[PDB]
Amino acid sequence: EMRIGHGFDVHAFGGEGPIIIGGVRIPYEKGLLAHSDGDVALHALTDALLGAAALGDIGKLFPDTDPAFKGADSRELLREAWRRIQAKGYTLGNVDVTIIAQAPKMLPHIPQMRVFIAEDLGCHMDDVNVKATTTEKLGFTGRGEGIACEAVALLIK
Amino acid sequence: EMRIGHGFDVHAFGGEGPIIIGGVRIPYEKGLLAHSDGDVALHALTDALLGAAALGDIGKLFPDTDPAFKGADSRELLREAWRRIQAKGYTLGNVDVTIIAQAPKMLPHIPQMRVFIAEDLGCHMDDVNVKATTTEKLGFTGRGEGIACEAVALLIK
Amino acid sequence: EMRIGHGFDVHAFGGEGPIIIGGVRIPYEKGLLAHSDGDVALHALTDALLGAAALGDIGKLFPDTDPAFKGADSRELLREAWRRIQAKGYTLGNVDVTIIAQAPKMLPHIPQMRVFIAEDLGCHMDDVNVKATTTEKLGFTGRGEGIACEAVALLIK
Ligand SMILES: Nc1ccn([C@@H]2O[C@H](COP(=O)(O)OP(=O)(O)O)[C@@H](O)[C@H]2O)c(=O)n1
Ligand SMILES: Nc1ccn([C@@H]2O[C@H](COP(=O)(O)OP(=O)(O)O)[C@@H](O)[C@H]2O)c(=O)n1
Ligand SMILES: Nc1ccn([C@@H]2O[C@H](COP(=O)(O)OP(=O)(O)O)[C@@H](O)[C@H]2O)c(=O)n1
Ligand SMILES: [Mn+2]
Ligand SMILES: [Mn+2]
Ligand SMILES: [Mn+2]
Ligand SMILES: [Zn+2]
Ligand SMILES: [Zn+2]
Ligand SMILES: [Zn+2]
């Protein structure tokens, strides 16, 4: 059996760079604001994975009032979600992530995100794809207020 | 054979609450403007299912020209779509919905949404996932202008 | 093996019509600005297909920088991407595209887009769905500033 999931996330710019996306530190004039590290790509991916498994979403796994994972980096959260998904009997088919950002340029950093994601999910780098697009200066991303990310995932059981 | 579909919808706030999302009435300071009940979750889901089956979109199935569904609630629209999709020989793999709203909070209402959706599609609740995310006060969702929803579905033949 | 992919694109209105969407010329008071024909639907679809095949994105394959692709139209790019994907051993499962635009009306033009996509991917028209939705005058699409498109694809290996 196969299952599909989808995730979407947005974080706002604020503070000083670098930003962290896909587990990779990217120099930039502004940072990403969040209680968390603000890794919009890993949050969206985590939600797609949890969604395919019908385990809810990242907020449901890591409640605001829960002290356990407060302070954790997003790679840690991805690995723990993944542990809980595998405990339900699933393995990974493949994942695809789309970063929506006017800047910074993501392409040079995409290879390194793929390695980190592949290590965290214990899969082949050929099962992991990441891309980026701008919105041609339109909307909150085009005005440089923040970054959004969409992801989809296919799990096998 | 398995087939994938994707849906997206947006409705604007207007008037007084409550709003209806995933078939669940939720109290709020404003209502959702729409000829229909404005249920963005169910419209996005209906489009994702129609999309997987290559049956077009909710506008093609329910034109303003057809009186049968004028004024029908969105659950009735989802069920008629599901009938057409089943007539094509499909059964449900799984669905995942992502509500994009700064407010109201969706978490406590999601259990009921899952039950209503599972009822409408004749499946187990474990084949239905619903999550939500804010856009951190950015964009028309972040400013509280309206609500958006994305959905993916996997059908089996 | 089955594999999923997702794509998203945006282009801004500017210049004279028509606009070109899914390979179809649609009359409109403005065109879509781009170094290209600005076909958001085909770009998003090309990205979903490349994504499923873990080949990156249209910008990795066809950099706006490289003269080899100067003046290529979006169908030529979709076909070349498809050529590369098939060379990797994949065949088409199905694709679903969602155009997000306040105007012009897409519905009358969608059947032709389906034909063109099916021709370019060498598949049956029934493996290709295209839909449209407005955002109810909200956001950059609602204000008539640009058009967005999301797509998903399922490939078989
Ligand atoms: N309208 C909404 C928005 C999000 N939420 C929940 O609140 C959690 C956090 O939302 P957020 O948009 O602040 O997420 P982050 O990437 O900051 O963790 C989500 O993961 C959902 O559990 C909700 O229930 N209702
Ligand atoms: N640019 C557009 C937008 C929507 N549509 C069609 O119009 C219908 C209604 O779009 P809408 O955004 O008003 O949809 P609702 O969720 O209000 O029903 C869609 O289902 C499509 O069939 C279109 O043909 N062209
Ligand atoms: N923040 C971003 C956005 C896009 N890109 C890359 O830049 C290319 C072109 O982006 P774009 O938004 O102008 O795309 P199109 O005009 O080609 O549809 C993308 O296809 C990615 O390869 C990036 O690396 N960093
Ligand atoms: Mn409408
Ligand atoms: Mn947050
Ligand atoms: Mn561009
Ligand atoms: Zn986040
Ligand atoms: Zn709607
Ligand atoms: Zn484009």
Q: Spell out the residues 6+ positions from residue B22 whose beta carbon is closer than 8 angstroms to its own.
A: B39, B41, B42, B97, B99, B109, B110, B112, B113, B114, B116, B117, B130
SS3 B116: helix
Name the strand (E) or helix (H) holding C96.
strand C91-100
Report the distance separating Cα B109 and Cα A62, nearest Å. 18
How far apart, in whole angstroms, are the C-alpha atoms of residue C133 and residue C98? Answer: 7
Chain C residues lying within 8 Å of B56, measured CB to CB? 110, 129, 131
Is residue B10 lining ligand 2, measured as CB closer than 6 Å?
no
The reply to whether residue A98 touches residue C152, judged by beta carbons under 8 angstroms, is: no
**Bridge partner list, C35:** none
Is the CA virtual torsion A60, A64, A70, A73 positive or negative? Answer: positive
Residue A19's nearest CA partner among A4, A36, A5, A2 is: A36
Ligand number nearest CA of A81 is: 1
Cβ C92 vs Cβ C129: under 8 Å: no
For an interface test with A, which of C8, C45, C47, C156 has the most A Cβ atoms less than 10 Å from its Cβ? C8
Is residue C1 a known part of a binding site?
no
Convert A101-135 to b/e letters by CB count within 10 Å (16 or more is b). Answer: bbebebbebbeebbebbbebbebeeebbbbbbbbb
Taking the centre of ligand 2 as the mean of its atom positions, its distance from the CA of residue B72, in whole angstroms, is 17
Q: How far is it, in rounded angstroms, from Cα A23 to Cα A40?
A: 10
| Distances from the Cα of C89 to the Cα of B1, C3, C83, C155, angstroms | 18, 12, 10, 10
By the 8 A CB rule, do B141 and B9 touch? no
Residue B39 to residue C108: CA distance in whole angstroms: 25
Q: What is the DSSP pairing of strand C146-156 with strand C91-100?
A: antiparallel
DSSP state of A65: T
Can you count the helices (H) and strands (E) in chain C? 5, 7
Angstrom distances, CA of residue C47 to CA of A97, A152, C77, C81:
11, 13, 11, 9
Task: For each of the domains in chain C, give its residue range(s) and CATH number, in order of start.
Answer: 1-157 (3.30.1330.50)
State the alpha helices, DSSP H only, in chain B: 40-52, 58-61, 74-87, 110-120, 139-142
Q: Round to whole Å and give the CA distance between C89 and C83.
A: 10
Residue B129 phi/psi, 5° resolution? -120, 140
φ, ψ (nearest 5 deg) of residue C44: -65, -45
Chain C residue numbers touching B57 (CB-CB < 8 A): 131-133
User: Is some CB atom of chain B closer than 8 A to the CB atom of A139?
Assistant: yes
Cβ–Cβ contacts within 10 Å for residue B107, how many?
15
CB half-sphere exposure, A6, CA atoms < 13 A: 34
Residue minimizing CA distance to atom 17 of ligand 3: C59
- What kind of experiment solved this structure? X-ray
Q: Other CB atoms closer than 10 Å to residue A83's CB: what's the count?
A: 9
SS3 (DSSP) at C121: helix
The answer to the question of whether A57 is labelled as a binding residue is yes
For residue A155, the SS3 value is strand
Instruction: Check if C139 has its Cβ closer than 6 Å to any atom of ligand 3.
Output: no
Number of helical H runs and strand E runs in chain B: 5, 7
The distance of B8 to chain C (nearest Cα, Å) reads 7
Q: Is C20 within 8 Å of C38 (Cβ atoms)?
A: yes
Q: A107 CB less than 6 Å from ligand 3?
A: yes
Q: Sheet holding C31-32: strands in order across?
A: C31-32, C2-14, C146-156, C91-100, C128-133
B2 neighbourhood in chain C, CB within 8 Å? 2, 93, 154
d(CA C127, nearest CA chain B) in Å: 7
- Has B101 been labeled as part of a binding site? yes
